[PDB]
C-alpha cells in the first residue's frame, strides 16, 4: 500500500519470490554494579536462530517468553516484590550469574478467614493499635526563570 518492494519474479526461470526483511534488531543486556558478567537477552527471537546465526553457545541459557536470554538461569516460580532491572511483561533479572525471575510490584493481603457468612455473620480484620505516620510529597510550583538574548 505504501509503495515499497515486497517481492519479484525471475524472467529466466519463471519463479516467484516473496521478500521478507531479515533480522537487524537489537539485544538487551542487563548489568549490575556488583556483578561481572552480562545477562544478554534477544527480544522476540528463538535460541536456534541465534545459535545458527551469531555463534555457538558458551554460557548457560534457556528459552523464555520474551526471547532467548543468555547467561541467566530461568526461574519463573520465584517472585520478587522489588526489582531494579525490569525487562518487561513482569520479568526481572538480578545477580545472586544472573537469574531470570518474575516480579510483582504489589501483592494482595491474603487472610485465613472464611468468605461466606456462617450464622449471618462475617469475618473482618479490624485494627486495635494505631501509629500516625508521615508521608512526603513535593509538587513543582516554581521553575527557574531562564532568559536568552538576541
Amino acid at each position: 500500500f505504501n509503495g515499497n518492494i515486497i517481492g519479484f519474479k525471475d524472467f529466466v526461470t519463471n519463479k516467484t519470490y516473496n521478500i521478507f526483511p531479515c533480522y537487524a534488531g537489537r539485544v538487551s543486556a542487563a548489568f549490575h554494579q556488583n556483578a561481572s558478567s552480562l545477562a544478554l537477552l534477544y527480544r522476540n527471537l528463538k535460541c536456534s536462530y541465534v545459535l545458527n546465526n551469531i555463534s555457538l553457545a558458551t554460557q548457560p541459557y534457556f528459552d523464555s517468553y520474551l526471547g532467548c536470554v543468555f547467561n541467566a538461569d530461568n526461574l519463573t516460580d520465584y517472585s520478587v516484590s522489588s526489582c531494579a532491572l525490569r525487562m518487561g511483561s513482569g520479568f526481572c533479572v538480578d545477580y545472586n550469574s544472573y537469574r531470570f525471575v518474575t516480579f510483582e510490584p504489589f501483592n494482595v493481603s491474603f487472610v485465613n478467614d472464611s468468605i461466606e457468612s456462617v450464622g449471618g455473620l462475617y469475618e473482618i480484620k479490624i485494627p486495635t493499635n494505631f501509629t500516625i505516620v508521615g508521608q512526603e510529597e513535593f509538587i513543582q510550583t516554581n521553575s527557574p526563570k531562564v532568559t536568552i538574548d538576541c
Binding site: N2, R26, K125
Partner: protein
C-alpha cells in the same frame, strides 16, 4: 544507528563527532519511557491501595452470589492462574483489538519463524522503530483489576467502603432521592437490572460503540505515527534518492559528504520533532492517567458528593475492567 542510518560504515563514521546531537534524543526517549512505566506502576499501586483478599478464595468455583452475575469480572482459576490470564469481559474487549501486548509480541515473534508478509510491524521493527512491551503485562493488570472487583464484594470489602455490593447500591441509590421502602421490596428487580446492564454492555461492542472507537483511534494513531515516521526515511529531502546504498554508491565518497550532511540533519530534526510530539502526547496521557486514577479511587472504591463526574446523570456505581492501553469503566 538504526533509524538514523542503515547498517553501513560511511553513515556510522560521520556519526562519531556528530553523535552528540542524538544523545539528547535517546535521553528524552528514556525519560518518556520512565514517565510511562512510573505512571503504570502508580496505577497498579492505586488499584490496590487497601485490598485484603482471602487465602481460601476459589475464583473459578465461588464467583456468583446475591443474584448478581460476576462471571465476566473473574479471570483466574486454581492457586496459580497461569493458563487463564484475563476474564470473559476482557476477552471480549481484547478480541476486537488484536494490537495489544500479546498481539505485539506475537507479531514480533512470528517474523522470522515462517509466515506471510502482510503487516508493517516487521518492516517497522527492523528499522529501529520497535515497541517494547510494558513492564507490567496485560495479564498482571487484569489480575489486579479482578482482585479489586472480587474484593469489592467478597469479605473483607475494600473497594466498597466496607459494605456488600447489594448494600452499597441500596445505600447509594438513597442519595438520589428514592427511599429504601421501595428498594427493599424490589431487590430482585435491581439484580435483574444489573444483569441486563452487564449483558447490554457486553453486547454493545459489536456495533459502533464509543469505547471501541477511541480504543481503535489510539491504536490507529500510534500505528499511523510510526508509519509516518518510517515514511520520513523514504523522503527525498531535496536529495537525488532516499536509499543509502544509492547515495553512497553512485556518488563519490569524497564529494558526497556535504550533500549527505543536509539529509542527515534533516532526518535528525525530523526525529527531534517526533520525540517532541511524543513527549507532549505522553504528558497528555499522564494527565489522562491522573484523571483515571482519580476516578478509580473516587468513584469505584468509594463515593463522594460530586455531580456529573462519575456519570452523566444520576450515578450509582462504577465498575472497573482492564482495556487495551487504558482502562474501562461501567458508569451505572
Amino acid at each position: 544507528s538504526l533509524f538514523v542510518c542503515s547498517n553501513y560504515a560511511a553513515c556510522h563514521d560521520l556519526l562519531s563527532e556528530y553523535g552528540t546531537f542524538c544523545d539528547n534524543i535517546n535521553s528524552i526517549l528514556d525519560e518518556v519511557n520512565g514517565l510511562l512505566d512510573t505512571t503504570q506502576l502508580h496505577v497498579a499501586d492505586t488499584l490496590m491501595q487497601g485490598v485484603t483478599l482471602s487465602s481460601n478464595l476459589n475464583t473459578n468455583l465461588h464467583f456468583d452470589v446475591d443474584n448478581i452475575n460476576f462471571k465476566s469480572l473473574v479471570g483466574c482459576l486454581g492457586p496459580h492462574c497461569g493458563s487463564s490470564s484475563r476474564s470473559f469481559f476482557e476477552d471480549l474487549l481484547f478480541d476486537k483489538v488484536k494490537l495489544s501486548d500479546v498481539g505485539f509480541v506475537e507479531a514480533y515473534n512470528n517474523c522470522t519463524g515462517g509466515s506471510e508478509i502482510r503487516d508493517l510491524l516487521c518492516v517497522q521493527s527492523f528499522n529501529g522503530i520497535k515497541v517494547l512491551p510494558p513492564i507490567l503485562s496485560e495479564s498482571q493488570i487484569s489480575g489486579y483489576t479482578t482482585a479489586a472487583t472480587v474484593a469489592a464484594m467478597f469479605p473483607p470489602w475494600s473497594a466498597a467502603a466496607g459494605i456488600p455490593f447489594s448494600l452499597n447500591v441500596q445505600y447509594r441509590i438513597n442519595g438520589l432521592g428514592v427511599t429504601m421502602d421501595v428498594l427493599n421490596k424490589n431487590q430482585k428487580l435491581i439484580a435483574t437490572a444489573f444483569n441486563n446492564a452487564l449483558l447490554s454492555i457486553q453486547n454493545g461492542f459489536s456495533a459502533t460503540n464509543s469505547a471501541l472507537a477511541k480504543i481503535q483511534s489510539v491504536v490507529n494513531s500510534n500505528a499511523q505515527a510510526l508509519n509516518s515516521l518510517l515514511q520520513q526515511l523514504f523522503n527525498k529531502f531535496g536529495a537525488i534518492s532516499s536509499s543509502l546504498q544509492e547515495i553512497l554508491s553512485r556518488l563519490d565518497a569524497l564529494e558526497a559528504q556535504v550533500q549527505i550532511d543536509r539529509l542527515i540533519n534533516g532526518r535528525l530534526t525530523a526525529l527531534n520533532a517526533y520525540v517532541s510530539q511524543q513527549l507532549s502526547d505522553i504528558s497528555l496521557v499522564k494527565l489522562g492517567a491522573a484523571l483515571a486514577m482519580e476516578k478509580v479511587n473516587e468513584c469505584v472504591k468509594s463515593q463522594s458528593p460530586r455531580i456529573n463526574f462519575c456519570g452523566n446523570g444520576n450515578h450509582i456505581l462504577s465498575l472497573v475492567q482492564n482495556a487495551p492501553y487504558g482502562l474501562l469503566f461501567m458508569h451505572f
